[PDB]
Design an enzyme around this catalytic site. Structure first.
Site, PDB file in Angstrom:
ATOM      1  N   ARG A 155     -36.854 -54.276  28.671  1.00  0.00           N
ATOM      2  CA  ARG A 155     -37.341 -55.612  28.355  1.00  0.00           C
ATOM      3  C   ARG A 155     -38.767 -55.558  27.818  1.00  0.00           C
ATOM      4  N   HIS A 156     -39.158 -56.625  27.129  1.00  0.00           N
ATOM      5  CA  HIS A 156     -40.451 -56.714  26.470  1.00  0.00           C
ATOM      6  C   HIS A 156     -41.378 -57.663  27.225  1.00  0.00           C
ATOM      7  CE1 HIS A 156     -37.925 -54.777  23.685  1.00  0.00           C
ATOM      8  NE2 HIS A 156     -37.604 -55.809  22.927  1.00  0.00           N
TER       9      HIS A 156
END
Ligand SMILES: Nc1ncnc2c1ncn2[C@@H]1O[C@H](COP(=O)(O)OP(=O)(O)OP(=O)(O)O)[C@@H](O)[C@H]1O
Ligand SMILES: Nc1ncnc2c1ncn2[C@@H]1O[C@H](COP(=O)(O)OP(=O)(O)OP(=O)(O)O)[C@@H](O)[C@H]1O
Ligand SMILES: [Mg+2]
Ligand SMILES: [Mg+2]
Lengths: 691, 69, 570, 37, 97, 50
Positions: free
Chosen positions: E31-32
């Protein structure tokens, strides 16, 4: 005024239709009669050549008649049908009476010595570079004089290095003191005369080009004020301001070192003949570098033009942004948009500076190219001249003179290279001025002028929309208004009554149907004439930065002050003006800053009523007012509507209760007509619902 | 006159403020991502013009040294 | 003080690249010494005995050094322009920040075109700085290295040049003030021209509503004639300057020619040395002609810097920054308010003493010109009272931050003007990242959603002018929504119902309960219907609070001015 | 040279007077040949 | 396409104090999150996780554990020609090297 | 030419009211007033255009 009646009589004699009051409107701005130059402007605008010339008493027998004589100290008259061997002259006096034959002694007593001669010569190009071509032709004497001066300047600059060649060829070798002194004094005299001649040349050229620029500016403003309202609606104020200041750019270019430099460059063949005479195989390099100069110039011109077009687009955007921010500084300061506002300013400013830097780097690249072309030719000239002086057929002084002649050849070229930026700036500036000027105007047919207006307003089958894609604003407006009829218009906010106000006066043209005033169609009627005959109090209600008396008398500045007093008393603002210190002379400021809302509302009401209009429109002239000031206008309506067709638009129904007819409009459809009690009687009507 | 004196005073007064008025160093791909203006102000010219000018410098210097010595 | 010294620190900021330009610049002159020197070699070692290979060497070594001059001058001016545009951007940002930080009394006493011309003088400075101006004076300043070489050739002609330079300086000082005065006059005329043009194009609707084109045409013609005549006087003075510089150059050149010829025929000088001297003289006087051709630009920049100083030295009212005052409620207290728009102007408000409690929907009614808008402008930090003070939340406003209060206060003014943006952005001008649903709720609450939904573009149509492109009532509703789209603690509705019909006024009156959920609202309106449900009515005439209290108790007295207006409405 | 711009120079640059005067003559038309010889 | 200049560049842990914020970091393996408001002399970083929660301040050790070494820099530059030979002119300019 | 000039071909300097009276007397004022240009429309040929 008499002189105007004389102009009308002359026009009738030459069989062209005129309106005296229309000429008074377009040429008596300051009032107090027409005058001489206003008369000549009117006659020229009528396509009627006139000239004010001084004429002797005996030379009046050879002029063509009629001829109006302009008396400085008094009234005028028109001489016609000169009689010989009788000492009698048939003059029409502008006092309304019969044409009288006047005897010699009284005429010589009543003649200043000047006259106006009249003749008629009856046998829209886009604004481009070609528009300057007649400007060249009109000022032909001055430009021919400047060409002669430039030729003599080149002759002086040519005689300068002959003395140098003499000194390095015949004075340096053997001996010499007297010849040296003669050369020195003659050269000092000739360079002094050269400097004086060049100064006079550029002074005269600057004066002539200044006159040309003044004419261009007058034409630009005259065409700008005649442009339609949708023109200003689609654009922004700063865009037009930048377009007008592009004329300042053109002028700042024009009266400088620009056209004198190219005139010197084009007159370089006089130098070329002498350099060719000195040596044949030393001028081919220059005669080949000149096409190299042309090739470099035509290579660098389009890229610089595209950079400067981008730079001007950025400049116009910045100008529009700045003017919009400053002109609405009250609401900008009232909230806290200033950080965002400065952020978008920084964005625009950085873009503009980047565009300017990208312009100037290309400009200096182009300058360095010209410098390189000069320097390579200089070094190969050194090489070939050294060969030609170590071999023969060329002396050292000849080489020195040739080198300085080449330098004086290339100095105009380097000056052109330095002001190439301004050349391209004018290249885009004339294009932008054309873009402003080539747009269609609010022109009217130049046919026979129309008489005065009785308030017969007929809207027939009207279908109007603001934009071609905009929703229809007025569907089927059909309506008739007679003289002395106090009509009131009411409806919801946004119904389209202001569109009716903007359609009475020729602000727009309807898409379908037509409006006729006194039976004359507006599709081709003169907008200026009707705007003169109609007094309108608008809704936006902005004022102009001048004195209050001048602001009220903006339409007719040549009238008295007691009329202004009467108008201010009818508007209910004469006292509020009187208790000011300066009275009517106080400065209202920009955008009516010095006055409040209701005060400037009453000022605008007085300004639009002080004239003598046949139609009088009040588009929400009451909404900004208050009670005990509303009632003053309500009481004064019996004097306001005396013979004038008055149309009142207001959301306050108390101002419409006494109207002869009340028109309810909703979504641009007229649903109800009649008197106040004729509409309020029915409870289901929209008037009762709004009540 | 006195304007030269006041210019010298101001010049020295801001001369003691060096390394406090200077801005921190940033490379190209970092300093082009700044607000439009800050980027316009803290971008150095480039590494190319400085090296070209210094190459011309070195060429002239070695030419003069070779010609004299 | 922004007299001229603002450039002194910033130039220091780029001192490194500038020293770099100096290290280049002097050596440029050295290159400008290389080419003429070679000439005398050609005229002292090639023309006397013989020569073909040494001339080859001279030509080969000269072409490269000439090309290196050309490219080095190009790179030098490129570096100078790039490092000066940064100073330009700094000056522009500072100028605009100070312009937006200026008080209202600064703007109202003058025109718009004046400030526009003042800001465009920055564009004039831009064209000056990234041009051929500072490079020429830098070449002239570092041309003194030629003089030593001059002293190598002859002392008499070097003395002639060293006396020519003070002639240049003295005559330039002689001619500078008249050109400066005429350019100042020209700038003032140009500023007046811009003011007239802006006030004529902005008010084009009123100009063309009447038929008064010819009077504006005559005024423009007179102003244009004056401006162009002043510019022509500036031009002829610049002509005099250039011609005098030519006269000095040519006279000194004649003296140099005569004295050099006499010296050469008298010995100790050669023809190659003389022509080298002539080349050096030409290349050292070329910067003088170069600066004389733009002396008018120099004087224009002097005027521009003076005018930017005139703008920037005006006292600003950006912020005070005192202890970070926390959020405010509807606690407004007037005490002994005395105020005049101008120091010579008559007093507007004499003895205004009012106290507004939180959540109190207070309305103010008065005659036209009584001064009801003065209270509106004095709640915000538009003006400073001459005597007495106002306080918000118990804190005096003589030291409070204007931006903080004016973002805590939502206002609809007597005259409503928008920007040339979309409705969704015009309403949300306070915060562009705020969600659409907030604007939708504000427009429904303000009664503005119906016509916008009926509009063809919805929230996408563009207000084409300050308030044009839409109707008057629609503009008023959009202004009301813009004022109500945030969560302000003090609301001021000055003529919020002026251009609106009775139905929209009724809609606003029904939504007024949702308007005032904990917000103190001051309603300035002549219409007594919209203030009937006000929490407290205040009547003012001639800048005096003359009746105050509830609506019914004040209307109960038949002799009251409010009651008088009441039967005047009926 | 130090005098400002006034009416005597204001009038001659007014564009109406430019419009009347067709084929205009400059203030110094004869000074060219006068200054040559 | 949004008229928003972006660039995926590799950046050292110390060079993150000189970039302009905000900056989305692209995690290859997961995830970012978006870093904003870098804090000096505190070893704390204000990152908004794209999981719908509050913007969290993360400590140095976990960030250096949860940072691959690349980042995306974002800036906005807000200051229809006919298809002719001139359309190839920018193509000449773009491939100038 | 125009109608105002075509009717007044005998004398172009004669006043408009004379032509108005002649057109009313000839029964020609009604359609001319109903015309879009009034007395300004141009007979495009020898008798065409009307
Ligand atoms: N300048 C314009 N450009 C484009 N559309 C316009 C313009 N002026 C008005 N409109 C459109 O025409 C409609 C009619 O507006 P108008 O100004 O006639 O209303 P109104 O009934 O006079 O308003 P109010 O009485 O509230 O002042 C507007 O709602 C808008 O959609
Ligand atoms: N910008 C100004 N400069 C100088 N005097 C002004 C200015 N604005 C207003 N005045 C004066 O102050 C008086 C009151 O000003 P203000 O704007 O407060 O009026 P107001 O009561 O809001 O007006 P209205 O009821 O007509 O809307 C005006 O009648 C006028 O005499
Ligand atoms: Mg309206
Ligand atoms: Mg007011």
């Amino acid at each position: 005024d008499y002189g105007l009646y004389a102009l009308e009589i002359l026009a009738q004699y030459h069989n062209v239709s005129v309106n005296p009051e229309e000429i008074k409107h377009r040429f008596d701005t300051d009032g107090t009669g027409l005058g001489l130059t206003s008369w000549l402007l009117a006659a020229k605008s009528l396509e009627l050549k006139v000239k004010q010339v001084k004429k002797t008493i005996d030379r009046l027998n050879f002029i063509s008649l009629p001829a109006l004589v302009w008396r400085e100290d008094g009234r005028h008259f028109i001489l016609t049908k000169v009689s010989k061997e009788a000492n009698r002259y048939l003059i029409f006096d502008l006092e309304q009476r019969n044409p009288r034959v006047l005897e010699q002694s009284e005429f010589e007593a009543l003649y200043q010595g000047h006259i106006i001669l009249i003749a008629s010569r009856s046998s829209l190009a886009k604004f481009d570079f070609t528009w300057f071509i007649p400007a060249i032709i009109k000022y032909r004497k001055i430009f021919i004089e400047t060409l002669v001066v430039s030729v003599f300047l080149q002759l002086f600059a040519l005689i300068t290095p002959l003395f140098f060649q003499v000194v390095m060829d015949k004075v340096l070798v053997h001996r010499g003191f007297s010849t040296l002194n003669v050369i020195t004094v003659a050269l000092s005299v000739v360079v002094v005369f050269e400097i004086i001649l060049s100064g006079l040349r550029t002074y005269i050229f600057a004066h002539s080009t200044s006159r040309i620029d003044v004419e261009l500016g007058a034409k630009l403003f005259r065409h700008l004020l005649a442009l339609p309202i949708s023109y200003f609606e689609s654009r922004r104020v700063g865009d037009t301001v930048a377009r007008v200041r592009e004329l300042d750019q053109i002028r700042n270019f024009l009266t400088g070192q620009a056209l004198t430099s190219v005139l010197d460059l084009l007159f370089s063949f006089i130098f070329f003949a002498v350099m060719w005479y000195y040596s044949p195989k030393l001028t081919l390099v220059i005669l080949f570098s000149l096409p190299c100069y042309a090739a470099w110039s035509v290579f660098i011109s389009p890229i610089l033009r595209r950079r400067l077009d981008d730079k001007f687009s950025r400049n116009a955007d910045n100008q529009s942004f700045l003017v919009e921010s400053v002109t609405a500084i009250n609401t900008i300061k009232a909230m806290a948009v200033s950080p965002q506002m400065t952020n978008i300013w920084d964005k625009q400013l950085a873009g503009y500076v980047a565009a300017g830097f990208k312009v100037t780097v290309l400009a200096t690249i182009g300058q360095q190219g010209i410098q390189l072309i000069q320097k390579t030719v200089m070094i190969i000239n050194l090489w070939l001249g050294a060969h030609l002086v170590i071999s023969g057929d060329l002396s050292i002084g000849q080489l020195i003179a040739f080198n300085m002649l080449a330098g004086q050849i290339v100095a105009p070229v380097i000056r052109l290279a330095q002001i190439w930026q301004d050349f391209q700036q004018v290249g885009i500036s004339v294009t932008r001025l054309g873009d402003v000027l080539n747009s269609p105007t609010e022109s009217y047919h130049g046919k026979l002028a129309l008489p005065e207006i009785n308030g017969n307003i007929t809207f027939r089958n009207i279908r109007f929309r603001y934009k071609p894609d905009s929703p229809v604003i007025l569907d089927n407006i059909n309506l008739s208004i007679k003289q002395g009829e106090v009509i009131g218009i009411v409806g919801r906010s946004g119904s389209g009554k202001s569109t009716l106000t903007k359609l009475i006066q020729r602000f727009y043209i309807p898409e379908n149907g037509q409006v006729l005033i006194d039976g004359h169609d507006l599709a081709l009627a003169d907008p200026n004439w009707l705007r003169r005959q109609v007094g309108v109090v608008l809704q936006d209600n902005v004022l102009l930065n001048r004195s209050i008396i001048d602001n009220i008398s903006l339409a007719n500045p040549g009238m008295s002050v007691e009329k202004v007093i009467y108008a201010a008393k009818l508007a209910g603002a004469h006292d509020f003006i009187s208790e000011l210190r300066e009275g009517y002379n106080t400065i209202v400021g920009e955008q009516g800053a010095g006055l409040s809302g209701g005060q400037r509302q009453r000022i605008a009401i007085a300004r639009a009523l002080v004239n003598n209009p046949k139609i009088l429109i009040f588009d929400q002239a009451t909404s900004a007012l208050d009670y005990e000031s509303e009632h003053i206008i309500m009481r004064n309506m019996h004097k306001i509507c005396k013979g004038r067709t008055v149309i009142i638009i207001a959301h306050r129904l108390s101002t419409v209760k006494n109207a002869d007819r009340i028109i309810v409009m909703e979504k641009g459809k007229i649903v109800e007509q009649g008197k106040h009690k004729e509409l309020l009687s029915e409870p289901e009507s929209l008037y009762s619902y709004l009540y | 006159s006195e304007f030269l004196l006041r210019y010298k005073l101001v010049w020295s007064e801001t001369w003691k403020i060096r390394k406090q008025l200077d801005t921190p160093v940033r490379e190209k791909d970092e300093n082009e991502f700044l607000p439009a203006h800050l980027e316009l102000i803290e971008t150095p010219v480039s590494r190319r013009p400085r090296l070209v000018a210094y190459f011309i410098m070195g060429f002239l210097v070695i030419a003069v040294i070779l010609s004299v010595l």
